[PDB]
C-alpha cells in the first residue's frame, strides 16, 4: 500500500514467499537495465544485431570424431548472450551479488530461492551474508537441472552450468556435428538448440537480445521422461 514502486509481481512463481528473491541491484551507470525487472517490453534492441553478430553458427564444427568427453567451461567475462557460451560449473553463489529471480533449467524452467548455505529457506530478500543460492548440479535425469542464469547486482547476466561436451566444445544440442551430442548429454542451461532457448518470464530480461525469437510449444525427453515446455527460437 505504501511505496508504490514495488510491482515485481509478474509470475516469478515457485518461491514460498516473495522475500525469497535476492534483490541487490545497482544500475550504477544509469542505463535502464534495472527498470527492465518491472517493465518488460521496452528493451532497446538497437545494439543487439552487432552483439550477436559476434557469435558464430554451429556450421563451424566438423562431423567425424566420435569420442565425446566432457570439460569444465571457461566462464569468460563475455555476457552469455550466445548459445555457444561455456558456463562455469554451477556453485554456491552469494545473494549479495544477484538481482531478481534465479532460474535453472531441467530443461523446464525452475526458480531457486535463497537458503542458509546449510540449505534452510531464508526470507531476508538476500541481505545477510548468510543468504546464498546453492546451485551445485548434475545433469538430469539423475541430477536436478542442466544449468542456471540470473542477473548481476550491476546489470550483467550470469551463467552457471554442467560441463559442456568435448569434441571442440558443445554446451547444447549440436546433433549435426555428432549424433550423441544431444541436449541430455551436453545441455548446460536454457539453450536447447544453437537457435533455441527455453522460455520463462525473465528470459527477455536475462537474454534481452532474444526479443524477437518466436515462442513454440515443444516436447523434450531426458532419459525417456517427457517434459512439455515452451521455447523461443529464431
Amino acid at each position: 500500500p505504501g511505496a508504490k514502486q514495488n510491482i515485481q509481481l509478474i509470475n516469478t512463481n515457485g518461491s514460498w514467499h516473495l522475500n525469497r528473491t535476492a534483490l541487490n541491484c545497482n544500475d550504477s551507470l544509469n542505463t535502464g537495465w534495472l527498470a527492465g525487472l518491472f517493465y518488460h517490453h521496452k528493451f532497446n534492441s538497437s545494439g543487439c544485431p552487432e552483439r550477436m553478430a559476434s557469435c558464430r553458427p554451429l556450421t563451424d564444427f566438423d562431423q567425424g570424431w566420435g569420442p565425446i568427453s566432457h570439460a569444465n567451461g571457461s566462464g569468460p567475462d563475455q555476457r552469455p548472450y550466445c548459445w555457444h557460451y561455456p558456463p562455469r560449473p554451477c556453485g554456491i553463489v552469494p545473494a549479495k551479488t544477484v538481482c531478481g529471480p534465479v532460474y535453472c533449467f531441467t530443461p523446464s524452467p525452475v526458480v531457486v530461492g535463497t537458503t542458509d548455505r546449510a540449505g534452510a529457506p531464508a526470507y531476508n530478500w538476500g541481505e545477510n551474508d548468510t543468504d546464498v543460492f546453492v546451485l551445485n548440479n548434475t545433469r538430469p535425469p539423475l541430477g536436478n537441472w542442466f544449468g542456471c542464469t540470473w542477473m548481476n547486482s550491476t546489470g550483467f547476466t550470469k551463467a552457471c552450468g554442467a560441463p559442456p561436451c568435448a569434441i571442440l566444445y558443445c554446451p547444447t544440442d549440436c546433433f549435426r556435428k555428432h549424433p550423441e551430442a544431444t541436449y541430455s548429454r551436453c545441455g548446460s542451461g536454457p539453450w536447447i538448440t544453437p537457435r533455441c532457448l527455453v522460455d520463462y518470464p525473465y528470459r527477455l530480461w536475462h537474454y534481452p537480445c532474444t526479443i524477437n525469437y518466436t515462442v513454440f510449444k515443444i516436447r523434450m525427453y531426458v532419459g525417456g521422461v517427457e517434459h512439455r515446455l515452451e521455447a523461443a527460437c529464431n
Epitope: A3, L23, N26, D27, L34, A35, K42
Partner: antibody, heavy 125, light 108 residues
Framework: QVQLVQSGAEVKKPGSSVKVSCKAS????????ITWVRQAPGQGLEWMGG???????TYAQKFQGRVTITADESTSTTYMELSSLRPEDTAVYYC???????????????????WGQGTLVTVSS | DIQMTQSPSSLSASVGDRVTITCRAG??????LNWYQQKPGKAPKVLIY???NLQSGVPSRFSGSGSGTDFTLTISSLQPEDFATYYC?????????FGQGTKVEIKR
C-alpha cells in the same frame, strides 16, 4: 548513461500553451521514467508530473488539468504541455529521468539523474 | 500532495564550519528521501539517495541521515566548492514533492 536533450526556449502570449520535448538516448530502454520540474527565475523547484515507460502519468495538484504529458516511443521523446499560460508560469522547465536505480532490503529507490539542460518558457504579451 | 519543509531557509558559514540542514514531511516517508545540490546557473545534481547514500563521485565530507519524518543533510569541513542551494525530495509517493530549498553562502 542516458541523455536528455530538451527543446528550445519559447515565448508565449498569455492564454496559449507550450509543449516541450525531451529526447532520450544512450540507454537500455525505449522509454524511461521521465519527470518534469519547473523553477521560476530565482525560485525553488516545483515538481509537476511524471510518466513511466508504460506511459502512465501522475501530476501534482498545483497543476492538474493544466499539464498533460505524452510520450512518443518512436523518437524516445516525451512531451510536457501546459495550458492557460499566465506570467506566473515563466520559468525554466526541466525534464529528468526518475529512474529506479537501487534495490535493497526489499525496497527499491528512484531518484533524478540525467537532468536535461532545461528550457526557458517566457510567457508575456 | 505531501509537504516538505527545510530549515534553515538560508544560511551563511565560513570555510570549515559544520553545517546541518533538515527536511520534514507531513506523513511518514521511511528512508525515501533524496538530496540535490543546485549551483547558480546550472540544473540540480543529485547528492544523496535513500536518505544516507552518496552518489558515486560525491566527496566524503557529505553525509545524510534520517528515517521517517526527519532527515538531516550535513557537511563537516565545508570547502570552496559546496557553495550552493540544497533541496530535499521525497520519493515515496508517485507524486514527488520538494522542499522549498536552503541556500548556503559563505561568511566573510
Amino acid at each position: 548513461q542516458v541523455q536528455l536533450v530538451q527543446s528550445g526556449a519559447e515565448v508565449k502570449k498569455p492564454g496559449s500553451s507550450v509543449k516541450v520535448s525531451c529526447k532520450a538516448s544512450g540507454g537500455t530502454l525505449n522509454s524511461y521514467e521521465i519527470t518534469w520540474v519547473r523553477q521560476a527565475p530565482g525560485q525553488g523547484l516545483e515538481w509537476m508530473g511524471g510518466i513511466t515507460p508504460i506511459f502512465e502519468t501522475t501530476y501534482a495538484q498545483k497543476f492538474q488539468g493544466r499539464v498533460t504529458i505524452t510520450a512518443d516511443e518512436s523518437t524516445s521523446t516525451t512531451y510536457m504541455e501546459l495550458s492557460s499560460l499566465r506570467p506566473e508560469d515563466t520559468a525554466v522547465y526541466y525534464c529528468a529521468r526518475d529512474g529506479v536505480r537501487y534495490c535493497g532490503g526489499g525496497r527499491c529507490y528512484n531518484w533524478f539523474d540525467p537532468w536535461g539542460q532545461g528550457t526557458l518558457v517566457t510567457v508575456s504579451s | 500532495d505531501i509537504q516538505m519543509t527545510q530549515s534553515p531557509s538560508s544560511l551563511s558559514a565560513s570555510v570549515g564550519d559544520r553545517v546541518t540542514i533538515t527536511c520534514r514531511a507531513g506523513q511518514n516517508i521511511n528512508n525515501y528521501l533524496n538530496w540535490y545540490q543546485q549551483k547558480p546557473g546550472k540544473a540540480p545534481k543529485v547528492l544523496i539517495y535513500a536518505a544516507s547514500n552518496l552518489q558515486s563521485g560525491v566527496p566524503s565530507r557529505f553525509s545524510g541521515s534520517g528515517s521517517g519524518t526527519d532527515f538531516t543533510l550535513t557537511i563537516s569541513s565545508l570547502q570552496p566548492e559546496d557553495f550552493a542551494t540544497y533541496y530535499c525530495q521525497q520519493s515515496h509517493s508517485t507524486v514527488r514533492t520538494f522542499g522549498q530549498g536552503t541556500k548556503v553562502e559563505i561568511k566573510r
